[PDB]
């Protein structure tokens, strides 16, 4: 029995293991929706207004995941300002702040979750009122500074109540440079939905050609009326890949008002000169769907979910939740012995 | 060719390796692994949002690190054992201190600046790390100061993965321009560029003396490339393998060529005689990764089936 002090590592391993099992048991039950497209100037923007208008859910917890981001923005902003004070040789209006400045470097490692004693708040209020700090803020175009720096520091009263709920505009302000992804953790009909709006296309084919597999649904955005043959080639390559034989393609033909006007004035033949149908929505949409689905050639079933949509009043949540439920049911029956 | 030069030497024969350990516990796809420099500790990356470092000798998980972003594509272990570097579609390389950590997990650095996904990374020492990204660039970062200090531009397509020379003085990169490029770290530029695959090249590794290397591609071939002769030496392709290759590693002597296939197998080639020497089976889904210990005693295989297996 070579257990000597060692019969302690196993116990640790079993506690870590239990933790890994518990997060894992909960996860994987999430319904994940992947949005792709953006092959145009503004597709995901159209997606964003439809999301704003027809999608919601702001529990306390989703607002809470932005707490660390708010704090990090604030701390990094004040750090940037202080460092610029050192760089530009700006002195305190009152030499007693030199003591604050020593504390400042200490309180700068105090950047933990939600340390907002009245003393720190007063130090920040005093710095923000300083003329050299105001001078830096008004010269912020020469360095990097959140545009909302003054907005928040001037709003500390509103910001510090424990019932603060970030607005939608607050979220829009959360700064995104090169990568995004959109997340929500709302509850609805006892299902936890997770919806992801991704862009970055026109070049990231390799990320979906094989990085995705097992996802619940694809949402493919197409610019109806906004080179083109290369797009058909990319879709052919992705669409017909043997590893994606069993994955559903769901199509939201968006900007339908402009498309309906364009097909009145712009023939479908610009894209497909061999098209002999009429320039009605139904025939042109059916023809496009046919051209895409014909690229498969290796699948007896289709289960394509086609939708007929209207204006800003369209009951979207009913439509989205019915489609989620039918796909989950058919995907639960497919592997329960019944067929 | 190597084949007509080594014909006289005896073949290796019966390679019957057995599982000495089965590492159980991921419950989703594994995307990455990395041997520690002791040929004993290792890190693995899974879509469960966990980075696990295991002591492979006892079969104990040393750490399970919860990741802030789950869309991981690459990870790396610092040779000192002091740090790891985990990537993601967030374009950020997060650095984690494994030793001065007085018990909780802490972000030690967030490397920001790539404009496409971080596809690969390799440490030099606790200072500098070389990384590749889908933004078509590679970059060397000073982690302490957080700045991209060196930048390797010249690829014209997405950069897929990278391989450090054994002496860490050179590195090679493979990209979707179907090219590999050899870079000198300190001048930050390309000495040589090697083309020939028609596919994006997804994978590459080195002969142990650092004087040659082999690549593996989704085009179902492996290729041998020589630095000093600057060209392909050999192609490895069964006619009935048209599927992608996921992973490569050499045996200690260079004698064995290990290759992972979409067909659920790891074929083992005799590098000297071009005969297939062996097969690693026992998995129910794609082998996505593999590796040979620095000391040569064992090989680990990682798979789409969420399991790792240890062989010798």
């Amino acid at each position: 029995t070579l257990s000597a002090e060692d019969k302690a590592a196993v116990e640790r391993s079993k506690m870590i293991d239990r933790n890994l099992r518990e997060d894992g048991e909960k996860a994987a039950r999430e319904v994940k929706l992947l949005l792709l497209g953006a092959g145009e100037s503004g597709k995901s923007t159209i997606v964003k207004q439809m999301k704003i208008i027809h999608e919601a859910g702001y529990s306390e917890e989703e607002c809470k995941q932005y707490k660390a981001v708010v704090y990090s923005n604030t701390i990094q902003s004040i750090i940037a300002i202080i460092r610029a004070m050192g760089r530009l040789k700006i002195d305190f209006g009152d030499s007693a702040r030199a003591d604050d400045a020593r504390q400042l470097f200490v309180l700068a490692g105090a950047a933990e979750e939600g340390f907002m004693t009245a003393e720190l708040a007063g130090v920040i209020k005093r710095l923000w009122k300083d003329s050299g700090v105001q001078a830096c803020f008004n010269r912020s175009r020469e360095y990097q500074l959140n545009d909302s720096a003054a907005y928040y520091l001037n709003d500390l009263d509103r910001i510090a109540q424990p019932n603060y709920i970030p607005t939608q505009q607050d979220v829009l302000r959360t700064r995104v440079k090169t990568t995004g992804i959109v997340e929500t953790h709302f509850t609805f009909k006892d299902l936890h939905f997770k919806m992801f709006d991704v862009g970055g296309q026109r070049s990231e084919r390799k990320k979906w050609i094989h990085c995705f597999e097992g996802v619940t649904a694809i949402i493919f955005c197409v610019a109806l009326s906004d080179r083109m043959h290369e797009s058909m080639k990319l879709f052919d390559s992705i669409c017909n890949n043997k590893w994606f034989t069993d994955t559903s393609i769901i199509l939201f033909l968006n900007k339908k008002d402009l498309f309906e006007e364009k097909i009145k004035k712009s023939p479908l033949t610009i894209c497909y000169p061999e098209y002999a149908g009429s320039n009605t929505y139904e025939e042109a949409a059916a023809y496009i769907q046919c051209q895409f689905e014909d690229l498969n050639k290796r699948k007896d079933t289709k289960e394509i979910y086609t939708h007929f949509t209207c204006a800003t009043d369209t009951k979207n949540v009913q439509f989205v939740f019915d489609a989620v439920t039918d796909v989950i049911i058919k995907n639960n029956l497919k592997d329960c012995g019944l067929f | 060719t190597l084949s007509q030069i080594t014909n006289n030497i005896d073949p290796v024969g019966r390679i019957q390796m057995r599982t000495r350990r089965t590492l159980r516990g991921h419950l989703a796809k594994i995307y990455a692994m990395h041997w520690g420099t002791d040929s004993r500790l290792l890190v693995s990356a899974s879509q469960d949002g966990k980075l696990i470092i295991w002591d492979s000798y006892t079969t104990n998980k040393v750490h399970a690190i919860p990741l802030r972003s789950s869309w991981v594509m690459t990870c790396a272990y610092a040779p000192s054992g002091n740090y790891v570097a985990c990537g993601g579609l967030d374009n950020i390389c997060s650095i984690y201190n494994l030793k001065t950590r007085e018990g909780n997990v802490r972000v030690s650095r967030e490397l920001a600046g790539h404009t496409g996904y971080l596809s690969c990374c390799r440490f030099l020492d606790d200072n500098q790390i070389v990384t590749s990204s889908g933004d078509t660039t590679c970059a060397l970062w000073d982690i302490e100061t957080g700045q991209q200090t060196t930048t390797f531009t010249g690829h014209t397509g997405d950069v897929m993965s990278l391989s450090l020379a054994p002496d860490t003085r050179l590195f090679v990169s493979g990209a979707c321009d179907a090219s590999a490029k050899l870079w000198d770290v300190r001048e930050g530029m390309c000495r040589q560029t090697f083309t020939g695959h028609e596919s994006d090249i997804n994978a590459i590794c080195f002969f142990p003396n650092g004087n040659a290397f082999a690549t593996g591609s989704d085009d179902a071939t492996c290729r041998l490339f020589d630095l000093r002769a600057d060209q392909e030496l050999m192609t490895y392709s069964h006619d009935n393998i048209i599927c992608g290759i996921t992973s490569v590693s050499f045996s200690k002597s260079g004698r064995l060529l290990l290759a992972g296939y979409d067909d659920f197998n790891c074929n083992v080639w005799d590098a000297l005689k071009a005969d297939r020497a062996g097969v690693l089976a026992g998995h129910d889904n794609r082998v996505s990764c593999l590796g040979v210990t620095d000391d040569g005693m064992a090989v680990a295989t990682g798979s789409w089936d969420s399991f790792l297996k240890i062989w010798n």
């Epitope: 000597a4 116990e11 | 909780n104």
Partner: single-chain antibody
Framework: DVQLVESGGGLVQPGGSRKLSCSAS????????MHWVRQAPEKGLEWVAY????????YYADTVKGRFTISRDDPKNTLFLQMTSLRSEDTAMYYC??????????????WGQGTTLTVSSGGSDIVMTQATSSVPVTPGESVSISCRSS???????????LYWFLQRPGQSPQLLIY???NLASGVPDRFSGSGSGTAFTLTISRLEAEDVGVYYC?????????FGAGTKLELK
């Protein structure tokens, strides 16, 4: 900043009960095992009790099992030691000591300041022998202290479970060497350890001022953990 602050000490009548506390902050308290070690007035260190991280494993010294209870409240990051039927021989300085056990870890790497308890008036264990109780030294010279055990400390797993600690006069003990070759953080490379099986030696080169104190060797092969009596360093 890792802190362990013991409290609850004092003077107690014999036969009474007393709960000591050790308050931890600045680290992941619940991930660490915790020990109580006591030191009689003019004597060496003797291990008293252990509670594992997660409280799954608890060990007591024989002279205390059944009667004394060690416990921890991990959510409140506090360790307790409830004593009963207190005797005069329980009078000691009591240290709380943290210890995490995993491959390559450094057990016993941080000690609290300790709290003093004073009680009023009214075999299978390995014997470790340092036959020389004190040695006079002069600065700059190099010394080698030795200690031996009646059984081999080399285990069938290949490890030799030997630790060396230093207690400077009036301060808490400080870990110096773990598992024969690892330099403790912050300890100068002028310390070195050697030995074989049952006899071991710690050597200091160019001994400095701060090096003065009592040096204990210790086995961690099996419980109860046991210390040597300690070796004092006197100036000439």
């Amino acid at each position: 900043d890792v802190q362990l602050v013991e409290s609850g000490g004092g003077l107690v009548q014999p036969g009474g009960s007393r709960k000591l506390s050790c308050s931890a902050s600045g680290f992941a308290f619940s991930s660490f095992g915790m020990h109580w070690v006591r030191q009689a007035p003019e004597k060496g260190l003797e291990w008293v009790a252990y509670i594992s991280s997660g409280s799954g494993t608890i060990y007591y010294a024989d002279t205390v099992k059944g009667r004394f209870t060690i416990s921890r409240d991990d959510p409140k990051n506090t360790l307790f030691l409830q004593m009963t039927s207190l005797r005069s021989e329980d009078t000691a300085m009591y240290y709380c000591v943290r210890s995490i056990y995993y491959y390559g870890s450094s057990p016993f790497d941080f000690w609290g300041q300790g709290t003093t308890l004073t009680v009023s008036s009214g075999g299978s264990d390995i014997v470790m022998t340092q036959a020389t109780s004190s040695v006079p030294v002069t600065p700059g010279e190099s010394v080698s202290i030795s200690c031996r055990s009646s059984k081999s400390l080399l285990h069938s797993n290949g490890n030799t479970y030997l630790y060396w600690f230093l207690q400077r006069p009036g301060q808490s003990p400080q870990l110096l060497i773990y598992r024969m070759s690892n330099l403790a953080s912050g300890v100068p490379d002028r310390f070195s350890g050697s030995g074989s099986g049952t006899a071991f030696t710690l050597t200091i080169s160019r001994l400095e001022a701060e090096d003065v104190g009592v040096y204990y060797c210790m086995q961690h092969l099996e419980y109860p953990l046991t210390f040597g009596a300690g070796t004092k360093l006197e100036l000439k």
